[PDB]
Amino acid sequence: AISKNLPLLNNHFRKHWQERVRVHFDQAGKKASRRQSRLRKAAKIAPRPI
Amino acid sequence: PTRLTKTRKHRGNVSAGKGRIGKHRKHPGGRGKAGGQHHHRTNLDKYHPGYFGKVGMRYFHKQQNHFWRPEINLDKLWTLVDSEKKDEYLSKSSASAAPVIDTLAHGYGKVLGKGRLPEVPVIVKARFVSKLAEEKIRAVGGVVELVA
Amino acid sequence: MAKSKNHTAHNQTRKAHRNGIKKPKTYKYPSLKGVDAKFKRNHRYALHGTAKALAKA
Amino acid sequence: GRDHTSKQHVRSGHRTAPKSDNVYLQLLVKLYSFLARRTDAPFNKVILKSLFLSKINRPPVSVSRISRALKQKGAAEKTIVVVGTVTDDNRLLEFPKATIAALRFTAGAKDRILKNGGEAITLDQLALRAPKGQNTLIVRGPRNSREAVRHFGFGPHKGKAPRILSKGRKFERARGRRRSRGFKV
RNA sequence: GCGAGAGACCGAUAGCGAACAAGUACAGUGAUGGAAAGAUGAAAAGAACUUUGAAAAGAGAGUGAAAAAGUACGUGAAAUUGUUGAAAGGGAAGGGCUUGAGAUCAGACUUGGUACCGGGCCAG
RNA sequence: GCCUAGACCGAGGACUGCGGUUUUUACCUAGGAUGUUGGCAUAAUGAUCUUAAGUCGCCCGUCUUGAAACACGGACCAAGGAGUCUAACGUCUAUGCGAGUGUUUGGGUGUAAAACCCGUACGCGUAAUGAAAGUGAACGAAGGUGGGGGCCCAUUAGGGUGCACCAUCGACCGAUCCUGAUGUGUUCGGAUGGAUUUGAGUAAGAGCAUAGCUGUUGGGACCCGAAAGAUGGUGAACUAUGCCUG
RNA sequence: GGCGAAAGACUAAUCGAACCAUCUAGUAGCUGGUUCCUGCCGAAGUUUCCCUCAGGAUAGCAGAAGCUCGUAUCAGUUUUAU
RNA sequence: UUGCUUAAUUGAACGUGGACAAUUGAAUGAAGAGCUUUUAGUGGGCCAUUUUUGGUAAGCAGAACUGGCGAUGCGGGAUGA
RNA sequence: AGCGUGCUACUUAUACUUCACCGUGAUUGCUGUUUUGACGCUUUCACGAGUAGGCAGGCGUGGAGGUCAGUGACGAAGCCUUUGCUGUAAAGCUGGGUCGAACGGCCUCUAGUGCAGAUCUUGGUGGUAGUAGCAAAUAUUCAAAUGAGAACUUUGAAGACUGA
RNA sequence: UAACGAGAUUCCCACUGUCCCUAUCUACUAUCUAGCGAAACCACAGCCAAGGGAACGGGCUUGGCAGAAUCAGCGGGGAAAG
RNA sequence: UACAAACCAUGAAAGUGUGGCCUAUCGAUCCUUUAGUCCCUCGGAAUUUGAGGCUAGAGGUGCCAGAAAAGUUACCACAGGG
RNA sequence: CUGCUACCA
RNA sequence: GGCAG
Ligand SMILES: [Mg+2]
Ligand SMILES: [Mg+2]
Ligand SMILES: [Mg+2]
Ligand SMILES: [Mg+2]
Ligand SMILES: [Mg+2]
Ligand SMILES: [Mg+2]
Ligand SMILES: [Mg+2]
Ligand SMILES: [Mg+2]
Ligand SMILES: [Mg+2]
Ligand SMILES: [Mg+2]
Ligand SMILES: [Mg+2]
Ligand SMILES: [Mg+2]
Ligand SMILES: [Mg+2]
Ligand SMILES: [Mg+2]
Ligand SMILES: [Mg+2]
Ligand SMILES: [Mg+2]
Ligand SMILES: [Mg+2]
Ligand SMILES: [Mg+2]
Ligand SMILES: [Mg+2]
Ligand SMILES: [Mg+2]
Ligand SMILES: [Mg+2]
Ligand SMILES: [Mg+2]
Ligand SMILES: [Mg+2]
Ligand SMILES: [Mg+2]
Ligand SMILES: [Mg+2]
Ligand SMILES: [Mg+2]
Ligand SMILES: [Mg+2]
Ligand SMILES: [Mg+2]
Ligand SMILES: [Mg+2]
Ligand SMILES: [Mg+2]
Ligand SMILES: [Mg+2]
Ligand SMILES: [Mg+2]
Ligand SMILES: [Mg+2]
Ligand SMILES: [Mg+2]
Ligand SMILES: [Mg+2]
Ligand SMILES: [Mg+2]
Ligand SMILES: [Mg+2]
Ligand SMILES: [Mg+2]
Ligand SMILES: [Mg+2]
Ligand SMILES: [Mg+2]
Ligand SMILES: [Mg+2]
Ligand SMILES: [Mg+2]
Ligand SMILES: [Mg+2]
Ligand SMILES: [Mg+2]
Ligand SMILES: [Mg+2]
Ligand SMILES: [Mg+2]
Ligand SMILES: [Mg+2]
Ligand SMILES: [Mg+2]
Ligand SMILES: [Mg+2]
Ligand SMILES: [Mg+2]
Ligand SMILES: [Mg+2]
Ligand SMILES: [Mg+2]
Ligand SMILES: [Mg+2]
Ligand SMILES: [Mg+2]
Ligand SMILES: [Mg+2]
Ligand SMILES: [Mg+2]
Ligand SMILES: [Mg+2]
Ligand SMILES: [Mg+2]
Ligand SMILES: [Mg+2]
Ligand SMILES: [Mg+2]
Ligand SMILES: [Mg+2]
Ligand SMILES: [Mg+2]
Ligand SMILES: [Mg+2]
Ligand SMILES: [Mg+2]
Ligand SMILES: [Mg+2]
Ligand SMILES: [Mg+2]
Ligand SMILES: [Mg+2]
Ligand SMILES: [Mg+2]
Ligand SMILES: [Mg+2]
Ligand SMILES: [Mg+2]
Ligand SMILES: [Mg+2]
Ligand SMILES: [Mg+2]
Ligand SMILES: [Mg+2]
Ligand SMILES: [Mg+2]
Ligand SMILES: [Mg+2]
Ligand SMILES: [Mg+2]
Ligand SMILES: [Mg+2]
Ligand SMILES: [Mg+2]
Ligand SMILES: [Mg+2]
Ligand SMILES: [Mg+2]
Ligand SMILES: [Mg+2]
Ligand SMILES: [Mg+2]
Ligand SMILES: [Mg+2]
Ligand SMILES: [Mg+2]
Ligand SMILES: [Mg+2]
Incomplete structure (x- = not known):
């Protein structure tokens, strides 16, 4: 269980971690939709600054 | 890539490099840091001495912002002077007009005294300085101005 | 039931003389x-x- | 049968080529393979071997090392040769006028060298102004200053650095590092 | 849940258990458990008619590009099996090496040059 | 010294060499086979397949000191079938930049999950040491000595200069212990000089990032395998016992 | 839990603790298996510690990558002296 | 040179300078020496000669040195780790 | 053709000697003739056992970027086959037959990538083997009808049984 | 301890194929045919003796030997199967 | 075991003495407790209690590199082991 | 010295 | 290791 001259690790994976894995596949989609929300909000109230 | 792994080369050989006697098993020796005082003592004593035990006093609710104090040495102190005006300052600097080096505004808490300064007066503004850093700054005709 | 070999120095000079x-x-x-x-x-x-003396000389 | 006094079919254990696939490094190896094969100058054989070396075996050479090598007696006008990267040193108070041939220059190092009236040339320009390496001086960087070497040969009473992820009072300082906690090694 | 667009994903023992009248058939008193199963052909053009037969079917014929595609449907491997042909075989058979015999395959008269020049192979 | 019988082989592919004979800038047996004759090209020759003969040949896989074993799995065939991915890491290598490095949390932009662009912070590194309060790295050409590739002067040798690195003696920083100057909120300060003590330190930075193999730890963790434990439910159509009615 | 004129009997072919689903791919120092070719190198069953004795860690043996050099000064051997 | 040591101008250690050159001071050999990192399998062994302990002995149990088998085919011992 | 001893010849191992070829390690040289391969060509010498294990170089499979303006209904893929060729090999290519719609070479990327075994999984198929067997409950028989076909159906005649 | 007992035990009378020691008879099988038609098991298979060998071989070594295809039985072996 | 720096004992002195003439006579982490420094910390700033640190002992693990631990199974189960 | 009560190295 | 006779 302990072998060689290696750093001693703290890998906190003893719970059911695989049920709580959030992978951000939607990073680009959220960026684009965030931009669209930002444009719509600006155009609604123009020329008043957002 | 999997095509570069030795799993591809072990195909056709019975034991996949794990041995016929040893027989790759689930967890011989325990899991994690098990047996660190019993059967992995020879490993922890050799490679991680000091692992077991307590040293020093605890500090409940330690806020690391209190201890922020980045160091800058004297051999690196003139890098905070504007690059476009460094040579002019190194030539025309005198007691009547010496460059001001604001170390806190550049992100440093203490001025330490490693290295040698140009023999040129400077005004160094610091939160903290070491004794030798200030002695070396005064020796070139400069001064340390404490700020907060 | 578990009586085995106790001790042996057989093959130890061979291993010592592979690299020593x-x-x-x-x-x-x-x-x-x-x-x-x-x-x-x-x-x-x-x-x-x-x-000091050699440096001065 | 033969009674073998040595291990059979043993490779030399030295690099005979760069591991790199950079075509321009291969052209440099071509030039110095020809020079080492044909000039009898030991410099060309050393340069040819050094072009094979890996990255950790070609540590960066600070412009301060070059300044110190040029401050050797009778070495002020020698051509400094670095098979590797020449880095800048903002701790210098001054740099001399010098000719330096290197694989690579950082922006600060090259700027300082040219600012002080010197030249920053490549090893192919070197092979034309000094095809036998005349009046040269090879400068190598520190190999044992690497961080990985701190942990090599760790053991009791060896004084090396433990392989550890965090640093502090709670991380490998009590038992075996202190007589108040048993023993110290 | 509703509506969309995709993928270096899987390709009918895979992918959901389910590509099909699949949470179906079926089991269990019950809670529950839970399959197998896609493919003629472009088009049924799914073989009229004659003949043997109690019939199923067969034989002719016919459709089709193909029936070496007939729904017991694309291709149609292996295990296993029938027939024909070849060979061997005294309490197993099978294998390697070597040669004989038989069978198969190959190659220099070359991309030969002009009666001759010269070449290929096997030998003295 | 001389004569004489047989077997196997013929690698190489202009010349270059060493010798020999020299009648000779020629020839040879001397840095590896040529000459000549016959036959054949519908074939002598070669390969494979089947089979006979001679000779040898135990059933593979596995655990094991030891298997053909009277040890275990295997009737046969097809299809499926077992070191993976991830978080954090060690070594090595390649690459970019380098006292810095890392665009991609986000913002801009777009031919729209792409490509392209932007910067503050932050992470790691550039300083260590002490439990901590704290303190914090040049006597000197960043030291001396012995080596040290390479370079310079030479001309066997010899001299000069000697990076990396090795051995060694020192210097500097923090901790520990000792000494204790001018002074003072008279108990603080801590100059100065030391000590078979100690640190994962300084002593002209080397790191950061991406990727790859290998190795590590946690994860289903190479694949299949318990006897058990727990949570929530379904059964007295069998059967055990009581009751009611026949 | 039931039920037992008591056998640990019976409780739907299930009883020294039923059946169903889930936790659950439970854990296994133990058994079994672990899929292409050629080339080069090539072991160990020993040391120390371990509720250690069918297991680990540690050292040894082995491979790989090399690096600094280039006859420098090495050896499972002899001789001579001690 | 020193703060060690000596009664000392004595020593101890480390040095500056000078002399002794390839028979630089025995043999034989040297597919070179030195150095580093990292990681696998293994941690049931067994046999022969010789030394050897317990046992009447054992194809028994336990040690020493070497060589082997394991991990290895080939020729011989008919057969056989 | 036994035992002790001496001698001569002779027999033959993957051992030794010479030579050929393969590979590994080292080694000689190669740029004014380097000359579209220098990760190449070339000179020389030595060496080759191997489980567990390590490393290297290759063979093969599904999919991806690029390329061959690649093959293909004038027949792709698959399958069968003493048609053969190439490679030490993993394998590649090819003749003939069958077949009917896609597929490959090369430079790279990637992985759910290679089976003889796991009392492996699912499906399929044998030998056993025309074998074990089809034997409790007393029992059937003649004729006619029907039908292509009657031990087994129907009807008649008989013989029996269950035996309230 | 009267009575009771598919309880355990000894002796006696009767009785007998339990035995000396076997024989004969009946039906149904087995057997042969028509029809129908499984399964266990199976590394490959199937003659011995000795040897050596994991110390009890079908295979190996050395001998004996060895001639198609088979039927009913049988229980030595297959260290037979489960 | 031999020194270094102290402070001592003894002897006229040189010397000798860091327990027993030598070879055995013993004990980690965590926790507690005592001695020492009266030093560091209790983190908004202080005082005094209290607590926590630093250095050295002691309380103990004899399975002595150091778990906290009674049986039975003839009702039994599983993984294996020749 | 008996009884009761207590038990983190 | 605390009480108590
Ligand atoms: Mg391995
Ligand atoms: Mg195995
Ligand atoms: Mg193991
Ligand atoms: Mg223990
Ligand atoms: Mg052992
Ligand atoms: Mg050989
Ligand atoms: Mg921890
Ligand atoms: Mg303690
Ligand atoms: Mg399906
Ligand atoms: Mg399904
Ligand atoms: Mg179909
Ligand atoms: Mg067709
Ligand atoms: Mg068809
Ligand atoms: Mg068909
Ligand atoms: Mg077939
Ligand atoms: Mg016969
Ligand atoms: Mg033949
Ligand atoms: Mg023939
Ligand atoms: Mg030839
Ligand atoms: Mg034989
Ligand atoms: Mg086994
Ligand atoms: Mg076993
Ligand atoms: Mg055994
Ligand atoms: Mg075997
Ligand atoms: Mg046996
Ligand atoms: Mg058995
Ligand atoms: Mg077994
Ligand atoms: Mg079996
Ligand atoms: Mg398959
Ligand atoms: Mg930064
Ligand atoms: Mg600090
Ligand atoms: Mg440094
Ligand atoms: Mg439990
Ligand atoms: Mg009821
Ligand atoms: Mg009872
Ligand atoms: Mg009982
Ligand atoms: Mg029941
Ligand atoms: Mg019960
Ligand atoms: Mg599993
Ligand atoms: Mg399970
Ligand atoms: Mg075990
Ligand atoms: Mg070898
Ligand atoms: Mg075992
Ligand atoms: Mg290991
Ligand atoms: Mg080990
Ligand atoms: Mg073992
Ligand atoms: Mg073994
Ligand atoms: Mg052998
Ligand atoms: Mg033999
Ligand atoms: Mg014999
Ligand atoms: Mg005789
Ligand atoms: Mg021969
Ligand atoms: Mg080999
Ligand atoms: Mg192997
Ligand atoms: Mg796939
Ligand atoms: Mg086309
Ligand atoms: Mg085709
Ligand atoms: Mg079609
Ligand atoms: Mg393509
Ligand atoms: Mg797979
Ligand atoms: Mg299979
Ligand atoms: Mg296998
Ligand atoms: Mg099976
Ligand atoms: Mg099956
Ligand atoms: Mg029958
Ligand atoms: Mg019957
Ligand atoms: Mg009656
Ligand atoms: Mg009764
Ligand atoms: Mg058998
Ligand atoms: Mg026999
Ligand atoms: Mg025997
Ligand atoms: Mg048998
Ligand atoms: Mg025989
Ligand atoms: Mg019978
Ligand atoms: Mg029998
Ligand atoms: Mg005295
Ligand atoms: Mg003393
Ligand atoms: Mg304490
Ligand atoms: Mg507070
Ligand atoms: Mg103690
Ligand atoms: Mg113990
Ligand atoms: Mg112990
Ligand atoms: Mg119990
Ligand atoms: Mg008992
Ligand atoms: Mg045994």
């Missing part, structure tokens, strides 16, 4: 670790004065 047996390297200056502290203390001053 290597003699330690010799150097011109041995370490003065373990040498008498009073001698080492004075030898420091003697070397310092010798270096």
